[PDB]
Amino acid sequence: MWFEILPGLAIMGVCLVIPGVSTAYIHKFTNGGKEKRVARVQYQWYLMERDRRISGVNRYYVSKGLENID
Amino acid sequence: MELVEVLKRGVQQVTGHGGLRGLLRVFFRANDIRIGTLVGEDKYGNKYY
Amino acid sequence: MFFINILTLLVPILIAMAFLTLVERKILGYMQLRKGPNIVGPYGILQPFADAMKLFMKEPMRPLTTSMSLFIIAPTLSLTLALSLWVPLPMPHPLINLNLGILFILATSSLSVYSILWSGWASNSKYSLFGALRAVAQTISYEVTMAIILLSVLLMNGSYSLQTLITTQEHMWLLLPAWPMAMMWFISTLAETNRAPFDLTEGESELVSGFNVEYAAGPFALFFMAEYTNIILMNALTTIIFLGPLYYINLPELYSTNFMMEALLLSSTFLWIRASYPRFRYDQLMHLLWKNFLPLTLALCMWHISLPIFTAGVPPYM
Amino acid sequence: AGRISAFLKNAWAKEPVLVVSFSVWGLAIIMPMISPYTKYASMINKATPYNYPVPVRDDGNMPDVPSHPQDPLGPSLDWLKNL
Amino acid sequence: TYKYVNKKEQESEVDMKSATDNAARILMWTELIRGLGMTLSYLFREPATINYPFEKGPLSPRFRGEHALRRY
Amino acid sequence: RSRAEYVVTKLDDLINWARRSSLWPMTFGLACCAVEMMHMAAPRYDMDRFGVVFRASPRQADVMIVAGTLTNKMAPALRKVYDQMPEPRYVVSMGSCANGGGYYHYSYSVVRGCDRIVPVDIYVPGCPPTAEALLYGILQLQRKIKREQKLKIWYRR
Amino acid sequence: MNNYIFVLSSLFLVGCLGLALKPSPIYGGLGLIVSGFVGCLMVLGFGGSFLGLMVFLIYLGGMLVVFGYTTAMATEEYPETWGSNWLILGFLVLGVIMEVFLICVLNYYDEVGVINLDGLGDWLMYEVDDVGVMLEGGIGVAAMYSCATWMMVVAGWSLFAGIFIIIEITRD
Amino acid sequence: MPSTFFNLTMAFSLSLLGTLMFRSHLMSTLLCLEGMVLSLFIMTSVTSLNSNSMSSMPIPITILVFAACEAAVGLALLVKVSNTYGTDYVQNLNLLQC
Amino acid sequence: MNLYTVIFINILLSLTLILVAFWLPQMNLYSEKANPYECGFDPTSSARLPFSMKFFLVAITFLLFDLEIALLLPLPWAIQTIKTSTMMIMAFILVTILSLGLAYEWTQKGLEWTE
Ligand SMILES: COC1=C(OC)C(=O)C(C/C=C(\C)CC/C=C(\C)CC/C=C(\C)CC/C=C(/C)CC/C=C(/C)CC/C=C(\C)CC/C=C(\C)CC/C=C(\C)CC/C=C(/C)CCC=C(C)C)=C(C)C1=O
Ligand SMILES: CCCCCCCCCCCCCCCCCC(=O)OC[C@H](COP(=O)([O-])OCC[N+](C)(C)C)OC(=O)CCCCCCCCCCCCCCCCC
Ligand SMILES: CCCCCCCCCCCCCCCCCC(=O)OC[C@H](COP(=O)(O)OCCN)OC(=O)CCCCCCCCCCCCCCCCC
Ligand code: SF4
Fold first, then answer.
1. How far apart are CA B41 and CA A47, in angstroms?
2. What CATH fold (topology level) applies to the domain F3-157?
3. Is B2 near chain E, with CB under 8 Å?
4. Which positions, given as ranges, span the membrane (chain G)?
5. Ligand 4: does its nearest atom lie under 6 Å from the Cβ of F17?
6. Which of C25, D35, F123, F127 has the greatest CB tally within 10 Å of its CB?
7. CB-based contact (8 Å) between E57 and chain F?
8. Domain boundaries in chain C?
């Protein structure tokens, strides 16, 4: 009947939810619990490079708050 | 409703072929899990429903 | 980790393509009062793997009249451009984040048309030549109309990125403001993907097989994979652009699930349309896209030029 | 005229795509000339601060420019906030 | 006797409602939508496919198959 | 036996499974037998359910179902489209005409069986054989190419 | 990652060399497509993506029409590629050798003239606004709508008159 | 930038050399013209991007527009030539010497 | 770098697929196997012969229209301008001129195919 299509539909559904979910999780894992920063303009790229220099570990995603200020 | 009745027919089709092994046997040999009245069985072992 | 991201994008897209072939067989069968494949595997789920293995263990054809270099180059080009078009889509986060995403999409689609053209010319056969020329006419018509459609839609959106489209459809689908050009975009995607009634290049009844009539086994498999990956691709692009899935900052899994459901619905609509309609004649396709779609597309482009100006709803740059 | 209306109805019956296209063209032409929000688009684009506001040297002769951003003087965007 | 399959009798004239109906038919693809609906109905029907070789198509005693020589 | 012999046998089983689960016939027919062939394509029997799908070009075909009377004027064309099929190819003669000439055996313009022109793998008898009989022949061909031992013969070489 | 632009420029030179050597127009259009893609990559590396993607799309449409035309009327029974003639293939390899010889001569004799291998990859991006919005290349082409309306109208009249011109030429 | 600009200038020189050295195919001559056009576009675009001349960035698009009009008219003339002779041969286009 | 990497991965994957497709199965090719396909008979003439094009005028028009598309494409950045009246007027003029050209060609039967 018409519900025999549903196994192939479910396989397609799993194979379509895997790329987006995995991409979001990989971005979060590689940026340390935060989303991957988007530098659409030179100002945002400069912010990312300033964060990378500020962190002292050459990783922009290691943010420094008020613990660096006396 | 009728959806639960369809699910009842489905679960009896699943648990109507003996066991899990019998269900897998009929599903991978005949590609069909319908339950029918056993009309007979011949001398060679073919079952007729 | 980026290579693992490449793998977890590429491999599930390929498996979804193969099960799209299976689900096309099942849906077409059930619309044709039959069942479709349910023997090879539990419910037919091993049928695409059987077909892939058979095609990759059948010998390829190298005809005497055929230009070998372009004959080899065309199918691998087609598959690479299909996966490249897949790469920048956000669900809701793209693997490759671009600024001019739809321009990348348009360039890669036209290069896929070139893959079809070079296959048809390299396979030195008259039916292949027919398929190449029909591809030329088809891509002329849908290229001009689809470019104007996408221009109007992104004029409503404000930028060429696609995360911007997610932010645009945060509150409402673009189907409600832009449903006529949504219909014209859907027809344009059908013609772009060469699906019935606008296939006209793998003409089963008019030609024999058209542009890939001399292709066998492996390269034919590459062409089929490229085409069906493009089907899922264009339906995914349609649901990203027009039917905006629910996006929440705290969880993107809801966006991925809604995107998957809408993309599956649009792909099933493609199979439904192939079942329902007879094939166009390829001059009638050009006459349609140049006499009905194009004047209305120009009018709606002017309307979407005017609309943010007199409503003060000019979209943000970022 | 009656013949004009009959021709328009015939066009709407047989070739509605061209009628819709011409109507949308005309509406896009005439709509910004009658809408009251048309000036607001240019004003919003002017108010969008893509560049840094370079301060001017105060010689004590211009009283209109504000000394501080949180001053009553200057181009406030209350119209945009309440838009 | 005979009948016409495509000849139209008289004319329906021109009306605003009829013109709008034809315009909606052309623009909104109404016959295409109802063709889609017909295919959808067939999708939700039950297929006519038997499970060969476990199910065989019906025959009659008159059926002419493989030859044989009989006995008393 | 040797461990590698078992691996070769399993690889043979895998290849034969793929080739018998994916059998694409050429869209080729000649007569009333081809009418019964599209009645096999019809929703009752569903060759597509069995995995059998027509392809128009002989390059994408795996099997050739000779369904009809092979005439003298047709024989070069039939040989041509058979030769243009790629190597793992099979031939199913269908009906008395393609088998041994049939009702036109003593005709001046009829090839007395398509086995004079192409090597036939499976003969399906009838005039016409029913779509049941043609489907039976297709399944018998699937069993026949399941019986193939190509890698095992290559290993034993 | 320093000689990437130089590699692209060399590939563009090779594609233009093949186009100059004039194979069958199918292969000429193929070489022009590859050259357009390479030029798009060069504009991408040097700056804004919009100009490169624009010339890529324009040349994709153009060589599509060119492919249709050369299958229509500019074709022959045996199309001529770069390898079908010994003279054309010899000119191809001789042009490659001459390119290598010329870049070596400009590297050694002329020192820092047009080509410097030590200085290669150092003078690609001269000055960039490190902090700044509204810097991409498409904004100038957008400023054609406002700053250069004369440019807009001459381009539009060129296309309009071109439609009339092609209709009158192919009127027959 | 200077090595890239020299390579682009040599690419234009090769395309001009191809245009000036005819073979039998007028379509190939038009392709050489389009290659000259492409080299001009890339030179103008990299010059504008190097000098940050966003005011002069409409110039490459204008070049593309007028050059595509040129290519369109060339294709129309090639259509007329092929209708006259059956081929696009510049050796057939020779009867105006007398 | 990442985009270049994934493009190269796609190239490698497709080259690997076509390479295994050409070197995995058994080869048996002869003259009739590799002769071109003409539905069972020999081709009367080569397929490299001239093949008439009935939409050549539409193709030239497509070139001009594609350049009109290239002109219209900087609109999403053009709508951010201060002088929106000039941009709106210029865009209206461009689209109206394009539409008038299309209408003139439709009137002069340029969209219709020859013969
Ligand atoms: C009365 O007079 C007469 C006629 O007049 C009417 C005649 O006509 C006539 C001639 C008669 C005939 C020739 C009979 C022919 C019969 C018919 C015309 C009727 C049959 C009907 C049709 C053909 C219509 C069928 C319609 C359909 C919708 C069916 C679908 C068919 C398709 C072709 C589309 C589906 C595609 C396929 C089956 C192939 C798809 C699959 C692949 C190519 C696989 C690709 C996948 C991969 C390569 C993926 C690989 C990648 C991975 C990652 C996989 C991972 C793998 C692992 C191993 C892990 C005669 C003689 C005649 O007398
Ligand atoms: C992605 C979102 C969903 C998209 C739709 C998906 C579901 C539906 C899919 C249906 C199946 C399609 C299969 C392919 C069909 C191909 C045929 C086809 O579509 O032909 C196109 C047909 C062509 O019709 P035709 O060709 O029959 O007409 C004859 C025309 N001549 C004589 C010139 C040849 O229709 C169109 O071109 C219409 C396009 C859409 C128009 C929408 C207009 C909406 C209203 C606008 C505003 C009106 C008011 C204005 C203001 C007034 C103020 C007072
Ligand atoms: C079989 C042969 C096939 C040959 C054809 C290959 C086609 C590949 C797929 C289609 C490509 C279409 C053209 C794409 C051009 C780049 C598109 C683009 O917009 O790139 C810009 C992007 C980043 O720019 P932007 O979006 O502005 O972001 C800045 C802030 N994030 O990204 C960048 O700036 C990155 C710049 C490089 C991107 C392209 C990389 C191409 C790699 C080479 C492929 C061919 C290799 C040679 C052949 C190998 C052997 C066959
Ligand atoms: S065997 Fe009988 S049914 Fe079949 S083709 Fe011959 S005459 Fe027709």
1. 80
2. Rossmann fold (3.40.50)
3. no
4. 1-21, 38-58, 86-106, 147-167
5. no
6. C25
7. yes
8. 2-318
Q: Rounded to the nearest whole angstrom, what is the distance from the C-alpha of residue G165 to the centroid of ligand 4? A: 63
CB distance F103 to ligand 4 below 6 Å: yes
The torsion angles phi and psi of B31, rounded to 5 degrees, stand at 55, 40
Q: Are F17 and C50 in contact (CB under 8 A)?
A: yes
Q: Which residues contact G45 (CB under 8 A, 6 or more apart)?
A: G4, G5, G8, G124
Helices (H), chain A: 6-30, 42-55
Helical H runs in G22-82? 25-46, 49-72
Task: Please state, as a whole number, how many other Cβ atoms lie within 10 Å of the Cβ of residue C5.
Answer: 20
In this complex, which of G19, G72, G141 lies closest to H35 when CB atoms are compared?
A: G19
- Rounded Cα gap, residues C285 and C117, in angstroms: 18
Helix axes I56-72, C126-157, angle to 10 degrees: 20
Determination approach: cryo-EM
Strands F122-124 and F90-94: parallel
In terms of C-beta density within 10 A (0-12 exposed, 13-18 middle, 19 or more buried), how is residue E50 classed?
A: middle
Contact between residue H30 and residue H74 where contact means Cβ atoms under 8 Å apart? yes
Pairwise CB contact (< 8 Å): F87 & I28? yes
Cβ contact (<8 Å) for D45 and I84? Answer: yes
- C118 touches G30 (CB < 8 A): yes
Which residues, other chains included, contact C220 with Cβ-Cβ below 8 Å and sequence gap of 6+?
A: C55, C75, C212, F59, F60
Cβ–Cβ under 8 Å, residues C54 and F74: no
Domains of chain F, residue spans: 3-157
Fold classified for H2-98: Helix Hairpins (1.10.287)
Distance CA C75, CA C73 (A): 6
Residue F67 forms beta bridges with which residues?
Answer: F94
Chains E and G touch (3+ CB pairs under 8 A): no
- Binary contact (C31, E39; C-beta < 8 A): yes
- Contact residues on chain F for I28, CB-CB shorter than 8 A: 87
Contacts with D, E 7-26, CB within 8 Å: 14-16, 18-20, 22-23, 26
Q: Whose CA is nearest to atom 46 of ligand 1?
A: C52
Q: Give the minimum alpha-carbon distance from C56 to chain F in angstroms, rounded to a whole number.
A: 10
Q: Is F127 annotated as a binding residue?
A: yes
C290 close to I94: Cβ distance less than 8 angstroms: no
Give DSSP secondary structure letters for chain E: ----SSPPPS-----HHHHHHHHHHHHHTHHHHHHHHHHHHHHTS------TTTS-----TT---S------
Task: State how far the Cα of A36 lies from the Cα of A61, in Å rounded to an integer.
Answer: 9
d(CA C262, CA C249): 20
Structural domains of chain I in order of their starting residue, each with its CATH number: 2-115 (1.20.58.1610)
Find tokens 């211009």 and name the residue: D62
What is the experimental resolution, given in Å to one decimal place? 2.9
F114 is annotated as contributing to ligand binding: no
Query: Buried b vs exposed e over C156-182: b needs ≥16 C-beta within 10 Å?
Result: bbbbbbbbbbbbbbeeebbbeebebbb
Touch test G–F: 3 Cβ pairs or more under 8 Å: no
From G40, G115, G18, select the one nearest H17 (Cα to Cα).
Answer: G18
- Cα–Cα distances (Å) from A49 to A46, A69, C119, in that order, read 5, 20, 46
C-alpha–C-alpha distance, residues B19 and B25, integer Å = 10
Q: What are phi and psi of H28, to 5 degrees?
A: -65, -35
Residue of chain I nearest H63, judged by CA positions: I67
Both structure tokens of E52: 């060969």
Chain A: residue nearest C5 by CA?
A23
Residue A29 is encoded by which pair of tokens? 């894992």
Which one-letter amino acid corresponds to residue I34?
A
Is F33 assigned a ligand-binding role in the annotation? yes
Token reading at E67: 């030859």
